[PDB]
């Protein structure tokens, strides 16, 4: 049973790396935050090894990192994964970064002759905890096929999008752009409904079998709005960061997406008003403030 | 309880097929429209014409209205020759028009003064939905009256819903339904243009998003029935979506509410119409945004 490396043991990485240990893998963990390392260790993971030592020793190494800088700091340079990867290693980045960085990563992997997949994930911490993540994978199909079963203990839907390394990332950004639209629509629509004294429960039962339906509507309303609980979940701040990546790509693709750009501002304002660390469904509360 | 004699005022885009479906369903239907061709077409199927609004109110068990505006509704319901002043003591009036919550309330206040029954039951689904009896009825008003008339409305639609005893509740839910459509069509249109611009396989992408939190009935509708096959025949026009968005925005502004994205969407669909997509399906907002592709 394989040796897996896991770099980034935060909100997503901790439950993912824990699940691998529970699944019977020997898991070596690295995180800048020694407390995160402590938590992973208590789950049965092994700490104390360098990023470089993970690259030399592990069959597959996953990364779950919070920014493009962090991904760059881990993959590149004399101490990083690509320079130190043994000849059979597979690296799988689950971080969300720009398509361009996906390409820069792949180009360094091809130069070192190591395997690399850009496999961003969807489903949040709840999905990570429950092994129901969606993996959207760009990169070599042979590498996908040989690591599909490991990713399959972490997620419920494992997809290969195409051989293009940024194909996963792109579908993910699209997914999250749609989420931004759906959350905004629910937030504004329900505010109108409430101001006019609608029973939001009866309304949902009707709209949920109409063209008003969306999984996000069901999520936001049933799991947050109805129970008056805005504990993340998936933050206003994280959604706005993803919308940022999507608008960046739109701008690089010479596209003006007027409602998308407005939404970036909507979530940015929700944050600046103090809902940044609330669940995205709290956009409802932000829009309702005026009542 | 007798529900054989049905009046139907407004034999237009929706009324004509609805009224004929009532005839086909064994009801004795008395129809009224300014449009003599519409009256003749109805009569030709076994509809009865030549009776006044007044006469329908006096003699019919239930009278439906399908009218094009608030003023048309007012002209039919109020005044000496109208429905309320001439309704017999057991009549039920059902308006299937879309008007403001405020008019729904004024209609009901007049119904209560006259001690007649009234439901505000706006329909959605277009001409084809009316023909195929797949309309949605979203109904506000008395539950007892709803329970009494559900069986008739049900021969005309697939989804018949009683929302609440608030007379405007059906209208309000209809408006919210259409507002969510506006958002969802906008997201699909913008998000797929981004995907297309970056050469994504839109079929594969749908397979993935349709079982992820990108999922919506509108995404399935717009993508599989319109965008994928490059068909932009309505369906549900840009122009009619934006009319209903306008009504949602009017209701908001009435309630002192600022809904910035909603107001922005009203303008997006107005610009889409101005660019030439007004009588296309709403899914054509994708083609509007896609004008930016190479
Ligand atoms: N949290 C979610 O709901 C969610 C959902 C889908 C995708 N994601 C994506 O997953 C990625 C990780 O997200 P997260 O929520 O777990 O972030 P997080 O900030 O909770 O965790 C990231 C971890 O990486 C560690 N780290 C940072 N730089 C490092 C370095 N050089 N070496 C080692 N460790 C380093 C941090 O200490 C932190 O513990 C992000 O790209 C995010 O977009 C998150
Ligand atoms: N067209 C659609 O696709 C559609 C779909 C769903 C809902 N609706 C709604 O249903 C309602 C009716 O729409 P429509 O397209 O059928 O309108 P329309 O203009 O085709 O039909 C209304 C009919 O009422 C008649 N009329 C007007 N005033 C009258 C009067 N005083 N006496 C007798 N007849 C009169 C007109 O001659 C016309 O035939 C509107 O409120 C609209 O918003 C329309």
From TrEMBL, chain A:
The keyword NAD applies. Residues 3-160 form the 6-phosphogluconate dehydrogenase NADP-binding domain. It comes from the Bacteria. Transmembrane segments: none annotated. The keyword Transmembrane does not apply. Coiled coil: none annotated. InterPro entries: 3-OH-isobutyrate_DH-rel_CS, 6-PGluconate_DH-like_C_sf, 6PGD_dom2, 6PGDH_NADP-bd, HIBADH-like_NADP-bd, HIBADH-related, NAD(P)-bd_dom_sf. Residues 167-285 form the 3-hydroxyisobutyrate dehydrogenase-like NAD-binding domain. GO terms for biological process: organic acid catabolic process. Its EC number is 1.1.1.31. Belongs to the HIBADH-related family. This is 3-hydroxyisobutyrate dehydrogenase. It comes from Bacillus cereus (strain ATCC 14579 / DSM 31 / CCUG 7414 / JCM 2152 / NBRC 15305 / NCIMB 9373 / NCTC 2599 / NRRL B-3711).
């Amino acid at each position: 049973m394989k040796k897996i490396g896991f770099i980034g043991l935060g909100n997503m990485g901790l439950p993912m790396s824990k699940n691998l240990v529970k699944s019977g893998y020997t898991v070596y963990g690295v995180d800048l935050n020694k407390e995160a390392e402590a938590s992973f260790e208590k789950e049965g993971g092994i700490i104390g090894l360098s990023i470089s030592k993970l690259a030399e020793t592990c069959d597959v190494v996953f990364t779950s990192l919070p920014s493009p800088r962090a991904v760059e700091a881990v993959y590149f340079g004399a101490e990083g994964l690509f320079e130190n990867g043994h000849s059979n290693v597979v690296f799988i980045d689950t971080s969300t970064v720009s398509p361009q960085l996906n390409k820069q990563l792949e180009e360094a992997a091809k130069e070192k002759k190591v395997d690399f997949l850009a496999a961003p994930v969807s489903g949040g911490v709840i999905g990570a905890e429950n092994r129901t993540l969606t993996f959207m994978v760009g990169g070599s199909k042979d590498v996908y096929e040989k690591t599909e079963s490991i990713m399959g203990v972490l997620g419920a839907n494992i997809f290969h999008v195409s051989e293009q390394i940024d194909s996963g990332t792109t579908v993910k950004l699209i997914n999250n752009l749609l989420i931004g639209f759906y959350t905004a629509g629910v937030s504004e629509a329900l505010t109108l409904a409430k101001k006019n004294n609608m029973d939001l429960d009866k309304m949902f039962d009707i709209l949920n079998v109409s063209y008003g339906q969306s999984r996000i509507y069901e999520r936001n309303y049933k799991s947050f709005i109805a129970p008056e609980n805005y504990e993340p979940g998936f933050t206003v701040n994280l959604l706005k960061k993803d919308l940022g990546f999507a608008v960046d790509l739109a701008k690089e693709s010479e596209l003006h997406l007027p409602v998308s750009e407005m939404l970036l501002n909507v979530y940015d304002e929700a944050s600046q008003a103090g809902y940044g660390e609330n669940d995205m469904a709290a956009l409802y509360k932000k829009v309702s403030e005026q009542l």
